């Protein structure tokens, strides 16, 4: 019902400690498998961290808050989801004796974590090394880390070219002190949406800038190519309409049947005159188009395209500029579809297609995926989004950080040295954060079979003397250099690992009481 005193602070720590201690074995390429026992006879043997956290049922709300962080962290970047949870859970474990045994007020710890968050991000920027994002050969080697050891390893050469051309397609590089820094505005979800086309070849798969539609020309004789096409978008379909009020039509006399037939031709023609007012070269309707409107717009010198999804029309407005209009009578002439490159209807894979593409970069596009079968397209789909997510973190900033625990130890060494010069009450919890930064590479040591006491102490001494790029190898298990042996990770993962873990750890310390009620 209610939790008071200092016991609720322990309950918040044990809630995050219970979730953290389970996924400790999910870190690294050598991560051990986990066996989940469902009430049904089935079981889940996979070691995927995001798949296990979704199948775990927890009681205390702080454990659910850690699961909500994993749902957001998994959408930002592909990997490192459990790294944030383990880091956020260890900070609360290292600060547990300071918050409880030392009788320190939680706001003092929370205010200290805000300073330690900025101090930890400044160290990562100094440890990271510059990288060339404009080199096509260098980006293919950076994406290859997320390609190999997968079903696409045979197509890895074609996968790196498909992923590089896909990231370069959606991104727009702009910066200035005038309107600000957009930070390249890279969105994988909406604008990179792909259309899987059965047949063809994996190498034949191209990344096209525009909206790809599966609907062909609706008239047998019509112009299939327009030099300078003009796209017009609208909602209300082209067909015979009815009155908005109650309409009762009872026709008895033989001469009363032709009255509705004449109105049927007039109501369809009035909708076509509203479209031709701007004299468009193309007509694209969200819903279907009757055969009557096909002939009325045919005499106007424009192509008719019906049955277009609403989610596509939102992306068409980016490649065209036509403003979405509901009623055809409200259609403005400002909706012209100018700057549309090619209308080519050329068929691909025994299915008639249409090209809305152009020569410009709206930051909207539809990737054309082709392969040996539909099952191959599904394997390329999920692997392409993970390949672009790694390439996205590289394009958001020209910096790379050493992995395998080198960046984790590089922050802990600089944090312990900087906290000695502050000389304040916050100095004690800073050492707890530095001890939590050392547990991530120590976790890799425990999974590698090496001595966690001996290897961690010797690895820390190498940072105070040598460089900060010396991590732990997964295959070997001995202290080695990450840069020389080719182990690297982008900084954006390290930026979201330190920021989201500390911010979530502060929110868990802010709740000293659990309120029960609806």
């Amino acid at each position: 019902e209610r939790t008071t005193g200092r016991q609720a602070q322990i309950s918040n720590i044990t809630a995050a400690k219970a979730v953290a201690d389970v996924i400790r074995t999910c870190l690294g390429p050598k991560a051990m498998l986990k066996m989940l026992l469902d009430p049904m006879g089935g079981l889940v043997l996979t070691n995927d961290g995001h798949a296990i956290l979704r199948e775990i049922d927890v009681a205390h709300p702080a454990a659910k808050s850690m699961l909500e962080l994993s749902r957001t962290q998994d959408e930002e970047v592909g990997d490192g989801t459990t790294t944030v949870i383990i880091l956020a859970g260890e900070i609360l474990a290292q600060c547990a004796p300071y918050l409880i045994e030392k009788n320190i007020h939680p706001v003092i710890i929370i205010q200290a974590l805000k300073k330690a968050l900025t101090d930890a991000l400044e160290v990562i920027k100094q440890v990271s090394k510059p990288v060339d994002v404009e080199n096509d050969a260098a980006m293919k080697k950076l994406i290859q880390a997320s390609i190999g050891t997968k079903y696409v390893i045979h197509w890895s050469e074609k996968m790196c070219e498909l992923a590089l051309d896909a990231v370069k397609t959606v991104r727009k590089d702009l910066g200035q002190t005038v309107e600000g820094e957009p930070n390249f505005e890279i969105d994988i979800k909406r604008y990179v949406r792909v259309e899987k086309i059965p047949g063809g070849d994996v190498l034949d798969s191209r990344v096209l800038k525009g909206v790809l539609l599966n609907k062909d020309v609706v008239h047998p004789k019509m112009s299939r190519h327009i030099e300078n096409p003009r796209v017009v978008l609208l909602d209300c379909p082209l067909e015979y309409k009815k009155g908005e009020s109650q309409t009762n039509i009872e026709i008895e006399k033989e001469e009363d049947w032709n009255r509705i037939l004449q109105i049927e031709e007039e109501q369809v023609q009035l909708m076509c005159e509203q479209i031709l007012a701007v004299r468009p070269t193309l007509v694209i309707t969200e819903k279907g188009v009757s055969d009557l409107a096909q002939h009325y717009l045919l005499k106007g010198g424009c192509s008719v395209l019906r049955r277009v999804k609403k989610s596509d029309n939102n992306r068409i407005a980016r490649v065209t500029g036509a403003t979405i209009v509901n009623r055809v009578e409200d259609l403005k002439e400002s909706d012209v579809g100018t700057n549309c490159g090619l209308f080519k209807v050329e068929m691909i894979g025994d299915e008639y297609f249409s090209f809305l593409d152009n020569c410009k970069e709206p930051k909207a596009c539809t990737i054309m995926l082709r392969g040996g079968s539909k099952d191959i397209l599904n394997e390329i789909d999920r692997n392409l989004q993970d390949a672009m997510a790694v390439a996205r973190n590289v394009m958001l900033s020209p910096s790379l950080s050493p992995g395998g625990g080198a960046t984790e130890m590089a922050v802990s060494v600089k944090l312990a040295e900087k906290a000695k010069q502050l000389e304040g009450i916050q100095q004690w919890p800073y050492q707890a954060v530095a001890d939590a930064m050392e547990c991530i590479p120590r976790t890799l040591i425990q999974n590698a079979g090496g001595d966690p006491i001996r290897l961690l102490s010797q690895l820390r001494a190498k940072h105070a003397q040598g460089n900060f790029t010396t991590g732990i190898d997964g295959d070997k298990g001995k202290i080695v250099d990450m840069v020389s042996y080719g182990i690297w990770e982008p900084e954006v993962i390290k930026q979201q690992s330190v920021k989201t873990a500390i911010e979530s750890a502060c929110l868990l310390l802010r709740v000293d009481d659990i309120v029960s009620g609806v």
Binding site: R2, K64, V515
Partner: protein
């Protein structure tokens, strides 16, 4: 414990009474107070509210937590009604009201062991409550310290400390405070209500953020289109024509194509559309309007009449801006010239009186400055800075910081908070308790000592020691109130508050923490209304 199953007094339900029900009332209000104990003040922290479904929510608002809090208890539901009374009236301060009533019940139960009758406890609170409001009314003061000191500046400075705007906020607070102070108007029958939304904030790319200028009047963002027109005209007096109807050549509709197969239709449509737009301009130059604002734009031929007449036209005006111009310039927005069967601008009826309209040259975008109209009192702020990305965050934070400033000024009678109300009234009731006496002095002493719980628990969430701060807070007001009634002072200064940001005791009047009279008076009076109703229950009959 838990008195039940009485062998006598056969009834259709259980019946409790005595010290058992009086102890349950203290334990009930203690658990409810502990829910809002950590949420008191801005230094408070949010809590989790878990339902029976298993979902939850996280919010730091003490009013939303008590509404969703499940409490089964006769006195506990009284505090729920007390929480709804503060939310429907004041809307803020519900957390502090519950803590007051909770400490009163704990000290009233101690008077039971002192053999004090509860009616005397109730009467002792009612007599002290009437005289406490009188003492609160004596320390009330209007808005002061605007000249020679800085108050509203520190209000906007603390509100901007959480945003990037807080770096230059020292220079930015001078523009928001000086403006809003002069924009105040009496509305109807001397209301003197500060406007909730005014002083339209613009943006510019020039220089740094410290170059932002405060214009003594309204400033619209737009250009003059053709530069053949003078940017400064009619210095002494100028009239501004506010027109929503366009001066551009009138078309039919956006969906009507012009296709002329009949040469009679070409001459009819042309001269008709051209004859109406010239008639609209003819009624302007004849009305003596030197400034014309059109929302849909102005054509090139219709603008030529304004060039020879030195009339400044503007194309594509914002409709939401011109509706406020009509109030500031005394003009009226013209929807259409088609009123009745005639066509004309109603000269001097829709034209507002103004002093001078001059275009000041600014970096990047250039605006139109309007100063000293007939009756305006308003102003405008044009922010020049590094980029719009920062100014967009500054403009949203400026309106949010303006919200904190306009609420403090909206109430012409304010009192310093942060512990000034609880500590000053505590010391006063200590010496005032002798003026009544007759078994009621113990009730006043417990009522006064119960006021220290508000600053106490407030300093707990700030990690500072509440025993030292609350104690020293009394020593500062005690020595300050010794020579105060004598109308002579040396070192005596009252109204010392508690600043938890810097961790020191300073005056809240200069610090920028002020509360209206409606907030403190209704919070103290209603807290006793729920406290008395709990003390009046000596028996609980439950089926």
């Amino acid at each position: 414990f838990n008195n039940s199953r009485s062998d006598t007094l056969f009834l259709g339900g259980e019946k409790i009474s005595g010290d058992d029900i009086r102890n349950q009332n203290v334990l009930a209000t203690m658990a409810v107070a502990n829910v809002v104990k950590s949420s008191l003040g801005p230094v408070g922290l949010d809590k989790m509210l878990v339902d029976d479904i298993g979902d939850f929510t996280v919010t730091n608002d003490g009013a939303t937590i008590l509404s969703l809090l499940d409490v089964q208890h006769p006195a506990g539901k009284i505090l729920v009604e007390l929480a709804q009374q503060q939310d429907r009236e004041i809307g803020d301060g519900t957390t502090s009201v519950v803590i007051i009533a909770s400490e009163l019940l704990k000290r009233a139960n101690e008077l039971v062991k002192n053999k004090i009758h509860p009616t005397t406890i109730i009467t002792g609170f009612r007599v002290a409550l009437r005289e406490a409001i009188r003492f609160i009314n004596e320390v009330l003061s209007t808005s002061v310290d605007t000249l020679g000191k800085e108050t509203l500046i520190n209000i906007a400075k603390t509100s901007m400390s959480s945003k990037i705007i807080g770096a230059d906020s020292d220079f930015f607070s001078n523009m928001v405070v000086d403006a809003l102070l002069a924009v105040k108007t009496q509305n109807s029958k001397g209301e003197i209500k500060y406007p909730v939304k005014a002083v339209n904030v613009l943006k510019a790319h020039g220089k740094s953020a410290t170059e932002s200028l405060l214009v003594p009047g309204y400033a619209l963002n737009c250009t003059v289109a053709s530069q053949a027109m003078p940017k400064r005209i009619a210095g002494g007096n100028v009239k501004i024509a506010c027109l929503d109807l366009n001066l551009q050549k009138a078309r039919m509709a956006m969906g009507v194509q012009i296709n002329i197969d009949d040469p009679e239709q070409l001459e009819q449509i042309r001269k008709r559309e051209a004859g109406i737009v010239l008639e609209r301009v003819k009624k302007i130059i004849d009305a003596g309007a030197q400034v014309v604002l059109t929302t849909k734009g102005i054509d090139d031929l219709c603008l030529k009449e304004f060039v020879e007449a030195k009339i400044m036209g503007v194309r594509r005006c914002k409709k939401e801006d011109l509706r406020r111009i009509a109030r500031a310039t005394g003009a009226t927005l013209v929807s259409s010239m088609s009123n009745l069967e005639g066509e004309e601008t109603f000269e001097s009826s829709y034209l507002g009186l103004c002093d001078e309209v001059v275009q000041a040259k600014f970096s990047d975008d250039e605006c139109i400055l309007i100063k000293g109209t007939s009756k305006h009192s308003s102003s405008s702020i044009i922010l020049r800075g590094a980029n719009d990305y920062s100014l967009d965050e500054m403009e949203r934070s400026l309106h949010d910081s303006l919200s904190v400033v306009k609420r403090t000024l909206e109430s012409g009678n304010v009192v310093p908070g942060g512990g000034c109300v609880e500590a000053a009234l505590n010391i006063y009731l200590d010496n005032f308790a002798t003026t009544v006496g007759s078994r009621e002095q113990l009730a006043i002493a417990e009522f006064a000592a119960a006021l220290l719980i508000i600053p106490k628990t407030l300093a707990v969430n700030a990690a500072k020691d509440s025993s030292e701060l609350v104690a020293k807070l009394r020593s500062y007001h005690a020595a300050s109130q010794m020579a105060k009634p004598e109308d002579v002072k040396r070192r005596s200064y009252r109204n010392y508050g508690l600043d938890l940001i810097r961790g020191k005791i300073v005056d809240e009047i200069h610090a920028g923490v002020l509360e209206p009279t409606i907030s403190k008076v209704k919070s103290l009076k209603s807290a006793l209304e729920a406290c008395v109703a709990i003390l009046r229950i000596d028996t609980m009959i439950t089926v």
